[PDB]
């Protein structure tokens, strides 16, 4: 995670969640094994002791379940972070590329557009992505999402303003205006 090179991320990301899982079960089952033995003694001990063993290990697992939590979030935040940089970086590019329009003999009307749908579908990936991500916050931590709606509302609005502000660049190139539209 702190190094990784194989381009495709879902690959890696999947692999990290994967081994994150092959790791917890390991430490977790060790407790379900330390617990079983544990009770195997409070078997002929007071019922008060039986009870404390239960409450002790009942807490060790919460401990672990917590570690893993954090541990897992730490993974996600990265992905998201890595995902967004891709998404922004691509977008920015298609801008110049779609900016490179298709100026020459017949302004490659098929390229302009070919290029356009890149920007568009791209910028949609943003919107589509910004949204998914949020739903998560809506569920998992309803309060967390409350705070962050004002924040993310602004974002979506930016894309909208941008997108149209992009299409509105045809208001600088008349030929392909009615031509492509």
Q: Judge residue 29's burial from the number of C-beta atoms within 10 Å of its C-beta, 0-12 exposed, 13-18 middle, 19 or more buried.
A: exposed
Stretch near Os ion under the rule CB under 5 A, chosen from 42-50, 98-106, 128-136, 139-147: 128-136
Nearer to a second copy, 3 or 55 (CB): 55
Q: Which of 117, 65, 118, 74 is nearest to 93 (CA)?
A: 118
The item of Os ion, a second copy, none sharing an interface with residue 25, based on CB under 5 to 8 Å by kind, is a second copy
Which of 90, 133 has the CB closer to Os ion?
133
CB burial class (10 A; 0-12, 13-18, 19+) of residue 98?
buried
Report the partner that residue 127 touches, choosing among Os ion, a second copy, none (CB closer than 5 to 8 A by kind).
Answer: a second copy
Burial of 94 (0-12, 13-18, 19+ CB in 10 A): buried
Q: Where are the beta strands (DSSP E) in the chain?
A: none
CB 160, min distance to a second copy, A: 6
**Which parts of this chain interact with Os ion (CB under 5 A)?**
133
**Which parts of this chain interact with a second copy (CB under 8 A)?**
25, 28-29, 32, 36, 65, 68-69, 127-128, 131, 135, 138-140, 156, 160
């Amino acid at each position: 995670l702190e190094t990784p090179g194989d381009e495709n991320e879902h690959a890696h990301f999947q692999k990290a969640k994967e081994r994150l899982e092959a790791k917890h079960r390991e430490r977790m089952s060790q407790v379900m094994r330390e617990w079983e033995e544990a009770e195997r003694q409070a078997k002929n001990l007071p019922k008060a002791d039986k009870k404390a063993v239960i409450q002790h290990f009942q807490e060790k697992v919460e401990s672990l379940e917590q570690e893993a939590a954090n541990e897992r979030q730490q993974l996600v935040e990265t992905h998201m972070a890595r995902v967004e940089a891709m998404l922004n970086d691509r977008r920015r590019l298609a801008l110049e590329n779609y900016i490179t329009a298709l100026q020459a003999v017949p302004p490659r009307p098929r390229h302009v557009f070919n290029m356009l749908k890149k920007y568009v579908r791209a910028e949609q990936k943003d919107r589509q992505h910004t949204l998914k991500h949020f739903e998560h916050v809506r569920m998992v931590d309803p309060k967390k999402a409350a705070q962050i709606r004002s924040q993310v509302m602004t974002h979506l609005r930016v894309i909208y303003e941008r997108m149209n502000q992009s299409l509105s660049l045809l208001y600088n190139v008349p030929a392909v205006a009615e031509e492509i539209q």
